[PDB]
Every structure is written in C-alpha cells, then in structure tokens.
Amino acid sequence: DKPQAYSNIIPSREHKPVYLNALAWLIQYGYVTQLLTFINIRVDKHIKMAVDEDLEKEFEYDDPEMQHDYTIILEPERATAIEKRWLYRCIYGQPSDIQILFNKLLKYFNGKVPMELVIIKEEISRHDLKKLLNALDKYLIEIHHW
C-alpha cells in the first residue's frame, strides 16, 4: 500500500515493544529504511501579483484558471528582495504561531534537509509540522526519499 506510519501494523499497545524490536531487527539487517520528508518552497502567479501590487504601493479579457505561472525558489536563504517578498507573502493570513514556525524553518526549506532532523534540531513537535503542511499545501513541495 501507500507508505504510512509504522503504528498501523501494530495491533495493540501490548504488541508495541515487540513490534518495535521487529522493526529494529528489520533495520539492522538492511531490510527496511525510513521514508523522510523533504520540503521545497513554490510560488504561483497570485503571490507574484500581490508582491507587484505591494511594490507599486511604495490576457486581460479572460481569466483562465489552468494556466498558472509557477516558480520554485530553490534556496530561500540566498533569496533576492523580490523573492524574499514572495516568501513573506506566502505567509499572509496565517496565525502568529504559524508565522514563528515558518520564520524558524525557512532556511531549511530547500529540498535537502529531512524534516525529522528539523524536528529533532529545532525542538518542535509533529502536530506543529503537520499543521504547517496542512495550512500551506500549494506553496510547499513535498519530496519523499530515504
């Protein structure tokens, strides 16, 4: 099936330590690896038009919705002024906790750092990360490999 969490194979909590021992046996023999989550940041035409409107603050007869002008910002750390405006307009209406978690995790959104290491290093939880994945779906590229 589609690769889900390991807890969906364990029937009960009494079987949990022996199933984790089975998982350790599988990993120690090279049978089973981990499927890590990698995140890259993507910007569509609406964010670009909003950034152009903000820049102006300081075809046309039709509106096709299947002709997006997308763009993938490969390394958001070394982004330019317009691209950092694209990143900071990706978070516009989100609450303050999402703003803080986006600010603390912006430099790791390059498609190379697995999110398990981001969870360990940045002392965040999985519910916060799944909140940020659900609240930002069309802007975040999801990359899954070992």
Binding site: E60, Y61, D63, P64
Partner: protein, 177 residues
C-alpha cells in the same frame, strides 16, 4: 419561440435598466452590438462596434465582462479598454416619424487609478454621480471616482463665468461682484 434572429453576436446579454426593449451582446471577434427586441420581432442591430471588447468568446469560457450599461442615466454605456481607460459612450436617439435609432454622440475617457483592470461595475451616488468598483487582474478590488468634467465655460458681458458639468444637473457661476 417568439423570434429566432440568426447572428454571431450572442454573448453576455445585458438588459438596459432604463429600457427593457434594448439589450446588448457581443461576439467572438469582439464586435459589440446593441439590439432592440421590437426590431427583431418585426433585422439589423441598432448599433455595432467592430473590435470593441475582448475576443475569444467561443474559445474561452472564463471571460471578464468589460462592458456595462449605465444605471445612473439612460442612453449611456461604459467599456473597458486595455485595463487602463474606461470609455463612457453617450448615445443619442431619434424616431423616424416608437423605435429609437441610436447613434454615438460623445465618448468620455477616464483613466483608471491602477492598471491591469479585468472587470468593473457601477456605483450610483447622489446627484447623478458615478463611481466605478473595479477588480484588478490579481483579484484586488478598489474604488475609483469619476471626475466632474466641465462641459461649457461661457463668459458674459459682465465678466461672469457659467460652468456646466458632464455628470450632474447643477450649474456653477463665478460672478464679478
């Protein structure tokens, strides 16, 4: 059906709010046409404007209405051109004697406050005023006024200036005292 008039200008029927007999369609090439239902019932269009509105009516399903009838006064309509200017076409009429034959009397051009406007609509105000709520290509909605342009500034033998507007009824006077 009461009548079936064959024409290729059959897109975006808009009834005139001041006269139900007059409606207005356009076509795939952008040819706007103001019609009369009595002429079709009995059959030419009452007016026709070659390449006035956007094209691709048959190919594209998601089209911005760049033409609105005037809900502030009769014999007027506004068109959106290139997302920058709005042309308020004022029409004149004459009856060859009940059906009024239309012709274009004056066109007034108003520059938009912001560019890249896709669609717009009227906001009626008091004293026959006009404001235009406009939606940009990025989805931003803003409000823009229509300026009071003086139509006639006649002087006098007493050096008195009389000003007439293109929008409202009242007449301004600058006396000499």
């Amino acid at each position: 059906p009461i009548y079936q008039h064959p024409t290729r200008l059959t897109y975006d029927i808009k009834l005139n709010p001041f006269n139900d007999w007059q409606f207005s369609t356009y076509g795939d090439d952008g040819t706007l046409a103001i019609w009369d239902r009595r002429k079709l019932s009995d059959a030419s269009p009452l007016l026709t404007f070659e390449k006035l509105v956007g094209s691709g009516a048959a190919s594209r399903k998601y089209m911005n209405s760049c033409f609105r009838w005037s809900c502030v006064r009769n014999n007027e309509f506004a068109t959106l051109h290139r997302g920058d200017t709005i042309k308020r076409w004022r029409l004149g009429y004459y009856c060859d004697s009940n059906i009024e034959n239309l012709f274009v009397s004056s066109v007034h051009d108003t520059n938009t406050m912001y560019d890249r406007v896709a669609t717009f609509d009227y906001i009626p105000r008091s004293n026959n005023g006009t404001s235009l709520i406009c939606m940009r290509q990025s989805g931003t909605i803003y409000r823009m006024p229509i300026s009071e342009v003086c139509s006639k500034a006649i002087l006098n033998n007493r050096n008195s200036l009389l000003l007439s507007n293109f929008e409202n009824t009242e007449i301004d006077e600058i006396r000499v005292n």
